[PDB]
Design a binder for these strands. Structure first.
Length: 453
RNA sequence: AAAAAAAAAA
């Protein structure tokens, strides 16, 4: 029921805004800096730690320059006498749940935290790429594709599971495979249920992302295997090479910083009355008139970091830059061209040379966020052009084989052409901001001079 | 109803 959904999302974002207002008011940040991105990431880490597990004191090799469970603080940067300064005394965590249950006066907002994580997810994904798994596990050159989705560091992401993308899901199989390559020998006993069941369900869902029943049954046949090994790994690798053209149903969730909902509940926003539309115009009209600023480091382009936060809010990193560009009204360039580093501020970075800058998060046109259209008609027909050469040498890849079975005939038939599906299809539904009812769409005209990625 | 377990980020 979409009605209760928009009701509940209005409620949760209203609760977020209220908790926003209060959480600020304690430490008393002035509202210009109270609607600012650094306090945005502070409250974000607070809601990151808000609902934890049992009490744990266990510590592992390589301490983290320290740790304390009594209370928790965050990077604090305040413009004092016109000059910013970072400071810290820590703040209790129980108190946090006490204030959060007051904000969600009687029923807490779990999906609210999921949506905050959604904010975090496009933030981190668009930010950059780390490769510590690369220094740990062996990995195929899938990165070479230059196109890969990524998950956040949040366990038990049942909701995340829906939005989730495919490539990193196979990677997650590989992560369990790493736990199993460093398998503690002393692990014989009841243990195995959670593992077998988890493998079952994750394999299920990774299969369920796409459509064609062939790879569905292939993924089931990898499932029924009792002892996952490198043969399963290479089978998943083919399946990934295919997923390149037979893309997965990777949905995109749009979320903004909480310093926007805060002044939006301060903007007399009766969210529930209109509801909210995470897939809808609502983030855009909220951002169209919002006011968010960010500590631009030295040698950084306000516009580049502006587009970075724009993508963090639109969940648009794994989308065609041409479309984004046509939607914002100014060229959306590859992250590499962004004269900017991460929005966060490493605790070592000096504040002496730090400066703030206004975020430009507006968009010329608006557009909806899908993952079905048979063939998007281009005025001069588009093809989703068939570049299948790296897949030629991929089907070669040392001439060993594809998935070895009837699948091999299925792949030596998929070789040529079937026109049965699409790939990386994020529906535009582009409209003028002056056309809220989305009465007339705008056939986009993209500049081919823009790196597709 | 009844559902898994470790470490900071350019």
């Amino acid at each position: 029921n979409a009605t209760e959904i928009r009701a509940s999302v209005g409620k949760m974002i209203n609760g977020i805004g209220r908790f926003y207002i209060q959480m600020c008011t304690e430490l008393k940040l002035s509202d210009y800096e109270g609607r600012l991105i650094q306090n945005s990431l502070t409250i974000e880490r607070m809601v990151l730690s808000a609902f934890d597990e049992r009490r744990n004191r266990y510590l592992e090799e390589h301490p983290s320059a320290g740790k304390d469970p009594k209370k928790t603080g965050g990077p604090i940067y305040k413009r004092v006498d016109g000059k910013w300064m970072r400071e810290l005394v820590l703040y209790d965590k129980e108190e946090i749940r006490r204030i959060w249950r007051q904000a969600n006066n009687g029923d807490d907002a779990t999906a609210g935290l999921t949506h905050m994580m959604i904010w975090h997810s496009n933030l981190n994904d668009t930010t950059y790429q780390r490769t510590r798994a690369l220094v740990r596990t062996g990995m195929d050159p899938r990165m070479c594709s230059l196109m890969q989705g990524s998950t956040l560091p949040r366990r038990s992401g049942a909701a995340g599971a829906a939005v989730k993308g495919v490539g990193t899901m196979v990677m997650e199989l590989i992560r369990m495979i790493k736990r199993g390559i460093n398998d503690r020998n002393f692990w014989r006993g009841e243990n195995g249920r959670k593992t077998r069941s988890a493998y079952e369900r994750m394999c299920n869902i990774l299969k369920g992302k796409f459509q064609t029943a062939a790879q569905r049954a292939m993924m089931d046949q990898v499932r029924e295997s009792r002892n996952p090994g490198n043969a399963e790994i290479e089978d998943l690798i083919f399946s990934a090479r295919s997923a390149l053209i037979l893309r997965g149903s990777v949905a995109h969730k749009s979320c903004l910083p909480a310093c926007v909902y805060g002044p939006a509940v301060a903007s007399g926003y009766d969210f529930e009355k209109e509801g909210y539309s995470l897939v809808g115009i609502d983030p855009f009209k909220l951002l169209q008139n919002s006011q968010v600023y960010s500590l631009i480091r030295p040698n950084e382009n306000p516009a580049h970091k502006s587009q970075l936060v724009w993508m963090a809010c639109h969940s648009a990193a794994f989308e065609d830059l041409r479309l984004l560009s046509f939607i914002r009204g100014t060229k959306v360039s590859p992250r590499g061209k962004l004269s900017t580093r991460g929005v966060q501020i490493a605790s070592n970075e000096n504040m002496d040379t730090m400066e703030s800058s206004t975020l430009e998060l507006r968009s010329r046109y608006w557009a909806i966020r899908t993952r079905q259209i048979s063939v998007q008609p281009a005025f001069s027909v588009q093809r989703n052009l068939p570049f299948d050469k790296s897949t030629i040498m991929a089907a070669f890849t040392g001439n060993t084989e594809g998935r070895t079975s009837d699948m091999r005939a299925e792949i030596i038939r998929m070789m040529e052409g079937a026109k049965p599906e699409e790939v990386s299809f994020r529906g535009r539904g582009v409209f003028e901001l002056s056309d809220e009812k989305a009465t007339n769409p705008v056939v986009p005209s993209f500049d081919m001079s823009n790196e597709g990625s």
